[PDB]
Amino acid sequence: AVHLKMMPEFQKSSVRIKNPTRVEEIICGLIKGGAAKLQIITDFDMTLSRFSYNGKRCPTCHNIIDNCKLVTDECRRKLLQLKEQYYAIEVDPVLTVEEKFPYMVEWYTKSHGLLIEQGIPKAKLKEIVADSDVMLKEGYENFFGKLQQHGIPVFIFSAGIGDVLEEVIRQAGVYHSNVKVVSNFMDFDENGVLKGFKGELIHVFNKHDGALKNTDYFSQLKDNSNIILLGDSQGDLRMADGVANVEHILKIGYLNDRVDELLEKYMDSYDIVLVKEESLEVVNSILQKTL
Amino acid sequence: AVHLKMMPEFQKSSVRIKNPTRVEEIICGLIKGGAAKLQIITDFDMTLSRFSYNGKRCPTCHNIIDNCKLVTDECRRKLLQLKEQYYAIEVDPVLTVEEKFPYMVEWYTKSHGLLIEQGIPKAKLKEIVADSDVMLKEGYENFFGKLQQHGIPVFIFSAGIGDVLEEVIRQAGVYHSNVKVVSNFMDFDENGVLKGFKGELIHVFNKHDGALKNTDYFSQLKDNSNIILLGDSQGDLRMADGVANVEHILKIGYLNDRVDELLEKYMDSYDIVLVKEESLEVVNSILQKTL
Numbered sequence A, B: 001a002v003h004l005k006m007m008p009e010f011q012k013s014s015v016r017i018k019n020p021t022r023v024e025e026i027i028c029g030l031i032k033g034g035a036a037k038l039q040i041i042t043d044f045d046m047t048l049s050r051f052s053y054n055g056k057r058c059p060t061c062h063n064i065i066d067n068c069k070l071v072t073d074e075c076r077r078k079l080l081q082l083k084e085q086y087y088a089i090e091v092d093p094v095l096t097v098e099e100k101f102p103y104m105v106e107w108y109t110k111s112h113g114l115l116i117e118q119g120i121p122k123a124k125l126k127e128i129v130a131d132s133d134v135m136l137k138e139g140y141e142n143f144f145g146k147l148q149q150h151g152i153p154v155f156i157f158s159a160g161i162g163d164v165l166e167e168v169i170r171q172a173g174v175y176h177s178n179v180k181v182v183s184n185f186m187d188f189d190e191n192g193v194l195k196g197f198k199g200e201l202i203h204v205f206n207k208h209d210g211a212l213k214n215t216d217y218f219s220q221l222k223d224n225s226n227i228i229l230l231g232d233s234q235g236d237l238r239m240a241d242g243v244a245n246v247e248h249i250l251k252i253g254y255l256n257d258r259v260d261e262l263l264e265k266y267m268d269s270y271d272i273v274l275v276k277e278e279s280l281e282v283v284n285s286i287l288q289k290t291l
Helices: A020-033 A061-066 A073-090 A097-117 A122-130 A140-150 A162-171 A207-212 A215-220 A259-269 A281-290 B020-033 B061-066 B073-090 B097-118 B122-130 B140-150 B162-171 B207-212 B215-220 B259-269 B281-290
Strands: A038-042 A154-161 A179-184 A186-188 A194-197 A226-231 A248-255 A272-275 B038-042 B154-161 B179-184 B186-188 B194-197 B226-231 B248-255 B272-275
Touching: A020 A226, A020 A248, A020 A281, A061 A097, A061 A122, A061 A154, A061 A162, A073 A097, A097 A194, A122 A162, A140 A281, A154 A162, A154 A207, A162 A179, A226 A281, A248 A259, A248 A281, A259 A272, B020 B226, B020 B248, B020 B281, B061 B073, B061 B097, B061 B122, B061 B154, B061 B162, B073 B097, B097 B194, B122 B162, B140 B281, B154 B162, B154 B207, B162 B179, B226 B281, B248 B259, B248 B281, B259 B272
Parallel strands: A038 A154, A038 A226, A154 A179, A226 A248, A248 A272, B038 B154, B038 B226, B154 B179, B226 B248, B248 B272
Antiparallel strands: A186 A194, B186 B194
């Protein structure tokens, strides 16, 4: 049996669970399936990376570029201006999620276009990432390490910048063979300088689309019918939409922000909500029982 | 410029090179291309793993199973008998390489079939690999680590057993995201017990076939037109036959065995021959200049 009262990780004040009996039965399915049936599907920014440290706000992958030596103060201004106009739409309680889709597309397009203008070489991304303030959540070496040890598939599905994301995880020593990254990857010219972005835009609201466009990946894992999903938004709940078959799925959401406004929604929609929490210890503890 | 005389790794008595001026110009092409243009294509057994240690002969991936606790003394007797009869054909100087093809197919088929009979569970491969005497060549942590650091593609192309190979590299902590394994993978039944092998057999003589059947992989790496190839056989010289375009290719061959018989042949066909050598320091030194 699985008992949340007896897992110290589940006793933190940051752990919010609408339906503990349901959680216990899902975790029990995960335990019975073991390694052979498990796969992970996860967001990156604010999910595997920290939202804040030392009082201080931590960068998204996009912010890592926004804030680097290869970008003008003036470009950061315009980027900030974009964030202020478009974020107000992201968080507008009146528009439906489908009405926000055109606005999100324009935000990433406008802000990617501004970076493309700054002249960003592939060769410098190591340096930029190395001097950035990026932080992975506490317990990431254990998270990635247990999963590589048992060869658990990990599908990182991110609306960030893929080249940045991969450089963060590679420098942290956790970019193992079991980790597949699906993101917005940069397109470079003859001289290895950023000129555009590859494929179809991934943003916060269209992860359903990308999930279905990755049939290839998911069909190869037909037997991995037990899923743990991690995200930080409502949009992340779509990341498992392309999975061949589902026996048990556990959905864990980081609520980093807008706590009073979103808590009820997150509790209704994620199985486990993690309120202003900068570690992976609840997921690590589920893994410890499972693997 | 490149001078082999000024690289201490190239001064070992085990380093045999028919044509040093040509090697120098290939290494110079590699250096000019840097990380952006490089990819690695390599055998595993006796190439990344050692042929011998402490006087003692080291196991291939197949040997790891042959010799484990889940496999009988009588099974081993039959497997040894198979090795005797089919190895004599492998090393027969009168048959052509094409005439040996049917025999190789029979050998892998017969010896895999004997293992399938032993009842080998997926779950036990970790334990088996952990108590085996497998050894990676000296300098492998640096080999795999520089390559992951620079995100260099590594295509390990092995006639061994893929599940075994992958468990060796994962326990060694070197199975990074940059490493793709193409091998003979086990097919498991309902209970996670070996029942057969997936796809088309890879053996020592048909690596051309598998190299062309991996067009997907190679077309994604169109720009990685500089190749370092590593193997231990004549057959491994085909492992680059599927590469989109070739600008510079360096072929490095481990001659572990049959030294007097094969040396002239290896010297004529590999660029650098490494005679009874248990380390990756010559390749690591080329990487040091390149990356």
